[PDB]
Short mmCIF file of N, CA and C in Angstrom, two decimals:
data_model
loop_
_atom_site.label_atom_id
_atom_site.label_comp_id
_atom_site.label_asym_id
_atom_site.label_seq_id
_atom_site.Cartn_x
_atom_site.Cartn_y
_atom_site.Cartn_z
N UNK A 1 0.83 -1.20 0.00
CA UNK A 1 0.00 0.00 0.00
C UNK A 1 0.87 1.26 0.00
N UNK A 2 2.18 1.06 0.12
CA UNK A 2 3.14 2.09 -0.26
C UNK A 2 4.29 1.49 -1.06
N UNK A 3 4.54 2.08 -2.22
CA UNK A 3 5.65 1.71 -3.08
C UNK A 3 6.53 2.95 -3.29
N UNK A 4 7.84 2.76 -3.38
CA UNK A 4 8.74 3.88 -3.61
C UNK A 4 9.19 3.84 -5.05
N UNK A 5 8.63 4.74 -5.88
CA UNK A 5 8.74 4.58 -7.33
C UNK A 5 10.15 4.85 -7.83
N UNK A 6 10.46 4.33 -9.02
CA UNK A 6 11.63 4.77 -9.74
C UNK A 6 11.38 6.24 -10.05
N UNK A 7 12.40 7.07 -9.86
CA UNK A 7 12.37 8.46 -10.31
C UNK A 7 13.74 8.92 -10.80
N UNK A 8 13.74 10.04 -11.54
CA UNK A 8 14.94 10.70 -12.00
C UNK A 8 14.71 12.20 -12.05
N UNK A 9 15.81 12.96 -12.03
CA UNK A 9 15.74 14.41 -11.89
C UNK A 9 16.80 15.12 -12.73
N UNK A 10 16.39 16.13 -13.50
CA UNK A 10 17.32 17.02 -14.16
C UNK A 10 16.94 18.43 -13.79
N UNK A 11 17.66 19.40 -14.34
CA UNK A 11 17.42 20.79 -14.01
C UNK A 11 17.81 21.68 -15.16
N UNK A 12 17.35 22.93 -15.09
CA UNK A 12 17.94 24.01 -15.84
C UNK A 12 18.12 25.22 -14.89
N UNK A 13 18.20 26.44 -15.41
CA UNK A 13 18.57 27.57 -14.56
C UNK A 13 17.41 28.01 -13.72
N UNK A 14 16.20 27.66 -14.15
CA UNK A 14 14.99 28.06 -13.43
C UNK A 14 14.27 26.91 -12.70
N UNK A 15 14.40 25.69 -13.21
CA UNK A 15 13.54 24.60 -12.73
C UNK A 15 14.30 23.33 -12.38
N UNK A 16 13.68 22.50 -11.54
CA UNK A 16 14.02 21.10 -11.50
C UNK A 16 12.87 20.33 -12.15
N UNK A 17 13.23 19.26 -12.85
CA UNK A 17 12.30 18.43 -13.61
C UNK A 17 12.36 17.02 -13.07
N UNK A 18 11.39 16.68 -12.22
CA UNK A 18 11.27 15.36 -11.62
C UNK A 18 10.39 14.45 -12.49
N UNK A 19 10.89 13.25 -12.77
CA UNK A 19 10.19 12.29 -13.60
C UNK A 19 9.88 11.07 -12.74
N UNK A 20 8.60 10.82 -12.47
CA UNK A 20 8.21 9.72 -11.58
C UNK A 20 7.52 8.60 -12.34
N UNK A 21 8.12 7.42 -12.34
CA UNK A 21 7.58 6.29 -13.08
C UNK A 21 6.50 5.52 -12.35
N UNK A 22 5.35 5.37 -12.99
CA UNK A 22 4.20 4.76 -12.35
C UNK A 22 3.49 3.86 -13.32
N UNK A 23 2.86 2.83 -12.80
CA UNK A 23 2.13 1.88 -13.60
C UNK A 23 0.74 1.78 -13.01
N UNK A 24 -0.23 1.49 -13.87
CA UNK A 24 -1.58 1.16 -13.43
C UNK A 24 -2.13 2.04 -12.34
N UNK A 25 -2.25 3.33 -12.63
CA UNK A 25 -2.86 4.25 -11.67
C UNK A 25 -4.16 4.81 -12.24
N UNK A 26 -4.97 5.42 -11.39
CA UNK A 26 -6.18 6.09 -11.83
C UNK A 26 -6.12 7.47 -11.26
N UNK A 27 -6.33 8.47 -12.10
CA UNK A 27 -6.33 9.81 -11.59
C UNK A 27 -7.74 10.18 -11.15
N UNK A 28 -7.82 11.20 -10.31
CA UNK A 28 -9.10 11.75 -9.91
C UNK A 28 -8.90 13.17 -9.46
N UNK A 29 -10.00 13.82 -9.11
CA UNK A 29 -9.95 15.21 -8.69
C UNK A 29 -9.16 15.36 -7.40
N UNK A 30 -8.96 14.26 -6.67
CA UNK A 30 -8.41 14.33 -5.32
C UNK A 30 -7.34 13.29 -4.97
N UNK A 31 -7.01 12.39 -5.90
CA UNK A 31 -6.08 11.32 -5.59
C UNK A 31 -4.60 11.68 -5.54
N UNK A 32 -4.23 12.81 -6.13
CA UNK A 32 -2.83 13.18 -6.25
C UNK A 32 -2.47 14.27 -5.25
N UNK A 33 -1.48 13.98 -4.41
CA UNK A 33 -1.01 14.96 -3.47
C UNK A 33 0.43 15.29 -3.86
N UNK A 34 0.69 16.58 -4.01
CA UNK A 34 2.03 17.08 -4.20
C UNK A 34 2.23 18.27 -3.28
N UNK A 35 3.18 18.16 -2.37
CA UNK A 35 3.53 19.26 -1.49
C UNK A 35 4.94 19.68 -1.83
N UNK A 36 5.13 20.97 -1.97
CA UNK A 36 6.41 21.54 -2.29
C UNK A 36 6.66 22.70 -1.34
N UNK A 37 7.73 22.61 -0.57
CA UNK A 37 7.88 23.47 0.58
C UNK A 37 9.34 23.50 0.96
N UNK A 38 9.96 24.66 0.79
CA UNK A 38 11.38 24.82 1.00
C UNK A 38 12.14 23.80 0.18
N UNK A 39 12.87 22.90 0.83
CA UNK A 39 13.67 21.95 0.07
C UNK A 39 13.04 20.56 -0.01
N UNK A 40 11.75 20.50 0.29
CA UNK A 40 11.01 19.25 0.33
C UNK A 40 10.02 19.12 -0.82
N UNK A 41 9.93 17.92 -1.40
CA UNK A 41 8.79 17.56 -2.24
C UNK A 41 8.20 16.28 -1.70
N UNK A 42 6.89 16.29 -1.53
CA UNK A 42 6.21 15.06 -1.22
C UNK A 42 5.22 14.83 -2.32
N UNK A 43 5.26 13.62 -2.84
CA UNK A 43 4.37 13.17 -3.86
C UNK A 43 3.68 11.92 -3.33
N UNK A 44 2.35 11.94 -3.33
CA UNK A 44 1.54 10.79 -2.94
C UNK A 44 0.44 10.55 -3.96
N UNK A 45 0.57 9.45 -4.68
CA UNK A 45 -0.49 8.95 -5.55
C UNK A 45 -0.58 7.46 -5.25
N UNK A 46 -1.28 7.13 -4.17
CA UNK A 46 -1.42 5.77 -3.66
C UNK A 46 -1.46 4.71 -4.76
N UNK A 47 -0.62 3.66 -4.65
CA UNK A 47 0.26 3.35 -3.53
C UNK A 47 1.57 4.12 -3.53
N UNK A 48 1.82 4.91 -4.56
CA UNK A 48 3.15 5.48 -4.75
C UNK A 48 3.45 6.63 -3.78
N UNK A 49 4.67 6.66 -3.22
CA UNK A 49 5.07 7.68 -2.25
C UNK A 49 6.52 8.13 -2.36
N UNK A 50 6.73 9.42 -2.59
CA UNK A 50 8.09 9.95 -2.56
C UNK A 50 8.16 11.10 -1.62
N UNK A 51 9.23 11.16 -0.84
CA UNK A 51 9.52 12.29 0.03
C UNK A 51 10.96 12.61 -0.25
N UNK A 52 11.23 13.78 -0.81
CA UNK A 52 12.58 14.05 -1.28
C UNK A 52 13.08 15.29 -0.63
N UNK A 53 14.37 15.29 -0.29
CA UNK A 53 15.01 16.49 0.21
C UNK A 53 16.10 16.93 -0.75
N UNK A 54 15.98 18.17 -1.21
CA UNK A 54 16.93 18.73 -2.17
C UNK A 54 18.09 19.50 -1.49
N UNK A 55 19.19 19.74 -2.22
CA UNK A 55 20.31 20.46 -1.61
C UNK A 55 20.08 21.96 -1.56
N UNK A 56 19.00 22.47 -2.16
CA UNK A 56 18.59 23.86 -2.00
C UNK A 56 17.05 23.97 -2.14
N UNK A 57 16.52 25.18 -1.94
CA UNK A 57 15.07 25.36 -1.83
C UNK A 57 14.36 25.58 -3.14
N UNK A 58 13.10 25.16 -3.16
CA UNK A 58 12.24 25.30 -4.33
C UNK A 58 11.12 26.21 -3.92
N UNK A 59 10.26 26.55 -4.85
CA UNK A 59 9.09 27.29 -4.44
C UNK A 59 7.87 26.87 -5.25
N UNK A 60 6.81 26.51 -4.54
CA UNK A 60 5.49 26.25 -5.10
C UNK A 60 4.83 27.57 -5.51
N UNK A 61 4.50 27.68 -6.79
CA UNK A 61 3.75 28.81 -7.24
C UNK A 61 3.08 28.44 -8.55
N UNK A 62 2.63 29.44 -9.29
CA UNK A 62 1.86 29.22 -10.50
C UNK A 62 2.61 28.32 -11.48
N UNK A 63 3.93 28.36 -11.40
CA UNK A 63 4.79 27.68 -12.35
C UNK A 63 4.85 26.18 -12.14
N UNK A 64 4.53 25.71 -10.94
CA UNK A 64 4.49 24.28 -10.69
C UNK A 64 3.55 23.58 -11.65
N UNK A 65 3.99 22.46 -12.22
CA UNK A 65 3.22 21.74 -13.23
C UNK A 65 3.51 20.26 -13.14
N UNK A 66 2.50 19.46 -13.42
CA UNK A 66 2.68 18.03 -13.41
C UNK A 66 1.89 17.49 -14.58
N UNK A 67 2.52 16.64 -15.37
CA UNK A 67 1.88 16.10 -16.55
C UNK A 67 2.19 14.62 -16.70
N UNK A 68 1.16 13.85 -16.99
CA UNK A 68 1.31 12.42 -17.18
C UNK A 68 1.74 12.16 -18.60
N UNK A 69 2.68 11.25 -18.77
CA UNK A 69 3.18 10.89 -20.07
C UNK A 69 2.97 9.38 -20.23
N UNK A 70 2.17 8.99 -21.22
CA UNK A 70 1.79 7.58 -21.40
C UNK A 70 2.86 6.75 -22.12
N UNK A 71 3.59 7.36 -23.04
CA UNK A 71 4.68 6.65 -23.68
C UNK A 71 5.69 6.25 -22.63
N UNK A 72 6.10 7.22 -21.81
CA UNK A 72 7.12 6.98 -20.79
C UNK A 72 6.55 6.36 -19.53
N UNK A 73 5.23 6.39 -19.39
CA UNK A 73 4.58 5.87 -18.20
C UNK A 73 5.11 6.55 -16.94
N UNK A 74 5.04 7.88 -16.94
CA UNK A 74 5.47 8.67 -15.82
C UNK A 74 4.67 9.94 -15.72
N UNK A 75 4.77 10.56 -14.54
CA UNK A 75 4.33 11.91 -14.28
C UNK A 75 5.58 12.78 -14.28
N UNK A 76 5.59 13.81 -15.12
CA UNK A 76 6.69 14.75 -15.17
C UNK A 76 6.34 15.94 -14.31
N UNK A 77 7.13 16.18 -13.27
CA UNK A 77 6.84 17.26 -12.37
C UNK A 77 7.89 18.36 -12.51
N UNK A 78 7.42 19.59 -12.68
CA UNK A 78 8.31 20.71 -12.93
C UNK A 78 8.11 21.73 -11.83
N UNK A 79 9.15 21.94 -11.03
CA UNK A 79 9.07 22.86 -9.91
C UNK A 79 10.14 23.96 -10.03
N UNK A 80 9.80 25.16 -9.60
CA UNK A 80 10.70 26.29 -9.67
C UNK A 80 11.73 26.28 -8.53
N UNK A 81 12.94 26.71 -8.83
CA UNK A 81 13.96 26.89 -7.81
C UNK A 81 13.70 28.19 -7.07
N UNK A 82 13.86 28.18 -5.76
CA UNK A 82 13.74 29.43 -5.02
C UNK A 82 14.70 30.47 -5.62
N UNK A 83 15.90 30.06 -6.05
CA UNK A 83 16.83 31.00 -6.70
C UNK A 83 17.26 30.65 -8.10
N UNK A 84 17.02 31.58 -9.01
CA UNK A 84 17.37 31.37 -10.38
C UNK A 84 18.88 31.21 -10.42
N UNK A 85 19.36 30.31 -11.28
CA UNK A 85 20.78 30.20 -11.59
C UNK A 85 21.56 29.41 -10.56
N UNK A 86 20.86 28.94 -9.53
CA UNK A 86 21.49 28.15 -8.49
C UNK A 86 21.53 26.66 -8.86
N UNK A 87 22.72 26.10 -8.80
CA UNK A 87 22.95 24.72 -9.16
C UNK A 87 22.58 23.77 -8.02
N UNK A 88 21.87 22.71 -8.38
CA UNK A 88 21.55 21.63 -7.47
C UNK A 88 22.47 20.47 -7.81
N UNK A 89 23.26 20.07 -6.82
CA UNK A 89 24.24 19.02 -6.98
C UNK A 89 23.60 17.65 -6.73
N UNK A 90 24.14 16.64 -7.41
CA UNK A 90 23.86 15.24 -7.14
C UNK A 90 22.43 14.75 -7.44
N UNK A 91 21.74 15.45 -8.34
CA UNK A 91 20.44 15.00 -8.85
C UNK A 91 20.54 13.69 -9.64
N UNK A 92 21.73 13.35 -10.10
CA UNK A 92 21.90 12.09 -10.83
C UNK A 92 22.11 10.90 -9.89
N UNK A 93 22.08 11.17 -8.59
CA UNK A 93 22.15 10.15 -7.57
C UNK A 93 20.85 10.15 -6.82
N UNK A 94 19.75 9.77 -7.51
CA UNK A 94 18.39 9.81 -6.95
C UNK A 94 18.34 9.21 -5.54
N UNK A 95 18.84 7.98 -5.42
CA UNK A 95 18.93 7.31 -4.13
C UNK A 95 19.30 8.20 -2.93
N UNK A 96 20.00 9.30 -3.17
CA UNK A 96 20.44 10.17 -2.08
C UNK A 96 19.39 11.19 -1.64
N UNK A 97 18.59 11.66 -2.60
CA UNK A 97 17.55 12.66 -2.37
C UNK A 97 16.38 12.18 -1.49
N UNK A 98 16.34 10.89 -1.19
CA UNK A 98 15.35 10.39 -0.25
C UNK A 98 15.59 11.05 1.11
N UNK A 99 14.53 11.65 1.66
CA UNK A 99 14.60 12.36 2.94
C UNK A 99 15.02 11.48 4.12
#
């Protein structure tokens, strides 16, 4: 009833781009929880659960976006960095970003 999904993360100067791999889910008006707060992201789409801690802060605002991709079978989550141009280290070591 909780699974820790495969995920991966890249960035540019404004955003981090989280890619969360999921199988056999159903969306609804209320099934998806995403909390973004300082350096934390929590994603809950039962059974799937991620709680991630980043090396710097993000900010939830109008720019936050999440889109399901059926070819890739993932939700692509795009969150803004609290500071433009700030580098986030070690995003290629997903295993470490677990809170």
